[PDB]
Amino acid sequence: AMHVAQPAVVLASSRGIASFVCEYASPGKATEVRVTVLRQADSQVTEVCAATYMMGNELTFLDDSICTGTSSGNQVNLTIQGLRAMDTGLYICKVELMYPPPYYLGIGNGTQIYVIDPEPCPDSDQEPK
Ligand SMILES: *[C@@H]1O[C@H](CO[C@@H]2O[C@@H](C)[C@@H](O)[C@@H](O)[C@@H]2O)[C@@H](O[C@@H]2O[C@H](CO)[C@@H](O[C@@H]3O[C@H](CO)[C@@H](O)[C@H](O)[C@@H]3O)[C@H](O)[C@H]2NC(C)=O)[C@H](O)[C@H]1NC(C)=O
Ligand SMILES: *[C@@H]1O[C@H](CO[C@H]2O[C@@H](C)[C@@H](O)[C@@H](O)[C@@H]2O)[C@@H](O[C@@H]2O[C@H](CO)[C@@H](O[C@@H]3O[C@H](CO)[C@@H](O)[C@H](O)[C@@H]3O)[C@H](O)[C@H]2NC(C)=O)[C@H](O)[C@H]1NC(C)=O
Numbered sequence: 001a002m003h004v005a006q007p008a009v010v011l012a013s014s015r016g017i018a019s020f021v022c023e024y025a026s027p028g029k030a031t032e033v034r035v036t037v038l039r040q041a042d043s044q045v046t047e048v049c050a051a052t053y054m055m056g057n058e059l060t061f062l063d064d065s066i067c068t069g070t071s072s073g074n075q076v077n078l079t080i081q082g083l084r085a086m087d088t089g090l091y092i093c094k095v096e097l098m099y100p101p102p103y104y105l106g107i108g109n110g111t112q113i114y115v116i117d118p119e120p121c122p123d124s125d126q127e128p129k
Contacts, residue, residue, distance in 0.1 A: 006093050006108040016083035018113040022093025023075040024105065029055055032099035035076050037067065040090040040110060048091075049078070052099065083115045 003025035012018035026033070033053035038045055051059030053071035061067055069078040076093060093108035121127055 004095070004106050004108055007111045009112040009114055010091075012080070012083050012088075012113055012115040014116050014118045015081065016087070016115055017079065017081050018083055018091075018115070019077065019079035020091075020093075020111050020113075021075045021077040022095070022108040022111070024095035024108075025074065026095075026097065026105060030097055030100050031055060032097060033071065033076075034094075034096045034098040035059065035069065035071065035078075036092070036094035036096070036107075037069070037078055038090075038092040038094070038110070040092070080113060083113060085115070085117060088113055088115045 006022035007020045010018045010020040031054050035051060035053050037049040039048050048064050049061045049067040049069060050063065051061055053059055053076060059069050059071060061069065067080055069076065076095065078093060090110040090112050092110040095107065096105050097103055119129065
């Protein structure tokens with residue numbers, strides 16, 4: 001245990017930019033480090049972004065994109081843009097050497113992404129939103 005570092009929460013900008021880096025630990029360097037980002041909800045949890053961190057290539061988020069992520073050394077950086085009040089929640093950083101056998105690593109418990117709601121008025125006493 002204690003071989004995976006990830007922020008428990010993440011502060012997002014007003015636009016909705018939530019970016020954090022979940023590092024992982026491996027016995028060596030390989031071409032395939034499958035990463036996964038999940039969103040947890042009280043009713044159920046669903047998959048979101050996923051790609052193979054190839055040390056000589058970039059992650060592909062063609063399926064369920066709506067997100068951008070980077071990977072360097074042993075730290076994977078995930079950035080989210082467009083987080084509404086409902087979008088705010090938990091994001092799980094996953095790290096799995098799934099392609100090479102015989103696959104053995106760990107997943108991140110998850111970082112909560114926080115966002116700020118801008119208001120056209122100096123206070124919410126009237127016309128709150
Ligand atoms: C996570 O790491 C990024 C740095 O990653 C940069 O962008 C990634 C998508 C990868 O391609 C990396 O190879 C690249 O170095 C930290 O900052 C990020 O910097 C980039 C570069 O300035 C920002 O995106 C750029 O946007 C311009 C505008 O069109 C483009 O021209 C560039 O091609 C590039 O896409 C990116 O917005 C920025 N991330 C943020 C703040 O959203 C980032 O800070 C770090 N995360 C944290 C907070 O640790
Ligand atoms: C955040 O981390 C916790 C850590 O929980 C235990 O995880 C194991 C691997 C070990 O490190 C131990 O020291 C930790 O306390 C994750 O919670 C654990 O999750 C696993 C599955 O992901 C659970 O295993 C289950 O085991 C039962 C057998 O009793 C099987 O029937 C199930 O199929 C399953 O394999 C384990 O019970 C959980 N333990 C705890 C303490 O909760 C947690 O999943 C992770 N967050 C993420 C990535 O979602």
